[PDB]
C-alpha cells in the first residue's frame, strides 16, 4: 500500500524508495509487542531469544461516517480498523534433517552392472 | 557435426550466408562469423547505400529512442539479416541467436582456429561474373561505422602472424614429407597402397 506516497532516504536500508512513519500503527503494534512479552514472561520463556514468529493484520468492520459533497450529495467516510495478531516464539536452530531413506528399485540389468562395478573395484 | 562452426565472411553474400547460418542455428549448430566487414552484398554500392538510407529513414515518430535501431557495424548488419530470418520473439529464436556469434575481423580465440566456407553463399560461385557487388565494410563506413581503419590494422597484424605460422607449418610439413619419402617404399606402405590407402 504505497501508491503515490513520497520517497525518502530512510528506505535505502530496506532497498526501497517509499517508506513512512506510521506513528499510530507503531504505537498499537508496540503495545501488542509488550503484551506478548508479558505473556511470554508469564509462560516462563527466555524473553531474549524471543522473535516475532507470526504477525498478521487483517481488516475489521468499518466504522461508518458521512461526508458532504457538492450539489447535495452524500458519500461514505469510513474507518478501516485492524485485527492484529502476533506470536513471539523462542528462537531455535534447524528443526530437523536426515530425510527419508528413498528406497531404490533396480532392475536385473542395473543389479548386474553394480555387481560388476563392485567386483572390478579393488 | 562440429561443436562450433567458424565461417569467415569474406566473399560471402550476406543474405545467402545469413539464411544458411540461421537454418543451422535452428537445427542446433553453434556458429561464429568473422570477416563480417569483408562480407559482400550483390548490387551497386550506391544501391545498397540508398537501401540503408531508407532503413535509416524508418524510425518511430514520437520517440526515436524506442524506434528501430539502425546498427552501423557490418557484423550487426549481418546479425540484423539473420534475426530477420529467425523467429526472434520466441524462446527457440532467442536460443538460436544465443548460439550465433558475429565479429569484425578475427579475435584471438577464432584466428587461432579453423575457418570454413559456405559454397552456397560464396560471391565467386554465385554471382555472374561482371555483376557489381558491394563490400559490407565500405557500406558500413559510409553509413557511419567508425572502426574500419582499426580493424584493417589489426587484421594486417593477424595476417602477418598467420603468414609466419604458415611458413613454419609448411617447412615442418615438407620435412615430414621428405622423411616419409625416405622411410617410404617399405612393405607396410606398399601393402597399404595396394590395398587402397
Amino acid at each position: 500500500f504505497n501508491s503515490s506516497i513520497g520517497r525518502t532516504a530512510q528506505g535505502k536500508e530496506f532497498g526501497v524508495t517509499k517508506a513512512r512513519w506510521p506513528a499510530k500503527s507503531v504505537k498499537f503494534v508496540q503495545g501488542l509487542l509488550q503484551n506478548a512479552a508479558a505473556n511470554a514472561e508469564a509462560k516462563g520463556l527466555d524473553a531474549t531469544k524471543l522473535y516475532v514468529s507470526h504477525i498478521q493484520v487483517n481488516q475489521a468492520p468499518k466504522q461508518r461516517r458521512r461526508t458532504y459533497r457538492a450539489h447535495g450529495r452524500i458519500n461514505k467516510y469510513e474507518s478501516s480498523p485492524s485485527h492484529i495478531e502476533l506470536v513471539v516464539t523462542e528462537k531455535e536452530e534447524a528443526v530437523a534433517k536426515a530425510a527419508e531413506k528413498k528406497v531404490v528399485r533396480l532392475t536385473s540389468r542395473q543389479r548386474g552392472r553394480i555387481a560388476a562395478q563392485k567386483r572390478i573395484a579393488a | 557435426v562440429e561443436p562450433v562452426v567458424v565461417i569467415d565472411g569474406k566473399g560471402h553474400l550476406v543474405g545467402r550466408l545469413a539464411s544458411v547460418v540461421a537454418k543451422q542455428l535452428l537445427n542446433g549448430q553453434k556458429i561464429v562469423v568473422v570477416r563480417a566487414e569483408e562480407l559482400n552484398i550483390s548490387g551497386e554500392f550506391f544501391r545498397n547505400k540508398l537501401k540503408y538510407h531508407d532503413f535509416l529513414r524508418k524510425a518511430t515518430a514520437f520517440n526515436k529512442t524506442r524506434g528501430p535501431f539502425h546498427f552501423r557495424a557490418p557484423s550487426r548488419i549481418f546479425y540484423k539479416a539473420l534475426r530477420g530470418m529467425v523467429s526472434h520473439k520466441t524462446a527457440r529464436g532467442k536460443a538460436a541467436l544465443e548460439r550465433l556469434k558475429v565479429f569484425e575481423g578475427i579475435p584471438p580465440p577464432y584466428d587461432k582456429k579453423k575457418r570454413v566456407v559456405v559454397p552456397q553463399a560464396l560471391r565467386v560461385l554465385r554471382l555472374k561474373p561482371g555483376r557489381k557487388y558491394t563490400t559490407l565494410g565500405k557500406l558500413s563506413t559510409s553509413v557511419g561505422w567508425k572502426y574500419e581503419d582499426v580493424v584493417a590494422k589489426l587484421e594486417a597484424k593477424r595476417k602477418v602472424s598467420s603468414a609466419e605460422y604458415y611458413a613454419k607449418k609448411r617447412a615442418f610439413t615438407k620435412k615430414v614429407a621428405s622423411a616419409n619419402a625416405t622411410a617410404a617404399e617399405s612393405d607396410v606402405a606398399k601393402q597399404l597402397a595396394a590395398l587402397g590407402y
Binding site: 528413498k102 531404490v104 528399485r105 533396480l106 532392475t107 542395473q110 | 557435426v1 535452428l26 537445427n27 542446433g28 527457440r92 538460436a96
Partner: protein, 106 residues
C-alpha cells in the same frame, strides 16, 4: 579405445507441421551425414533414443530416455519421420538424439 559410440548422431528438429499447425505425434529427425532419401531408406525402421538428464534419481539413475523409431523419410534432403513412445517435449528442437543400428538387416 577413446570411441565407444555404437549409434549415429541425429538432431530432433521439429514436428510434422503445416505452415501454422503442427502435429506433435510425429517428429522430424536429421541424421548426421545423411543428405538424401536414398540413405534415409537404409535408416528406415530403426530405433531412436532421446537421452536426457534429470536432477532427481528415479530408478537408480539420473538419466531418462524416450524411445521411438525412424519409420519413413521426409522430403528430398535426408530428413526422416520418427514416432516416439511419448512425443518429444518440443523444447528439444534441434536437440541431439541417437539412432541405433538395430533392428539390423546387414
Amino acid at each position: 579405445a577413446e570411441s565407444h559410440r555404437l549409434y549415429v548422431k541425429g538432431k530432433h528438429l521439429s514436428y510434422q507441421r503445416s505452415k501454422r499447425v503442427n502435429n506433435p505425434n510425429v517428429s522430424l529427425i536429421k541424421i548426421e551425414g545423411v543428405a538424401t532419401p536414398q540413405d534415409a531408406q537404409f535408416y528406415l525402421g530403426k530405433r531412436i533414443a532421446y537421452v536426457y538428464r534429470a536432477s532427481k534419481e528415479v530408478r537408480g539413475s539420473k538419466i531418462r530416455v524416450m524411445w521411438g523409431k525412424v519409420t519413413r523419410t521426409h522430403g528430398n534432403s535426408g530428413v526422416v519421420r520418427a514416432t516416439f513412445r511419448n512425443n518429444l517435449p518440443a523444447k528439444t528442437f534441434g536437440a541431439s538424439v541417437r539412432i541405433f543400428l538395430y533392428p539390423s538387416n546387414i
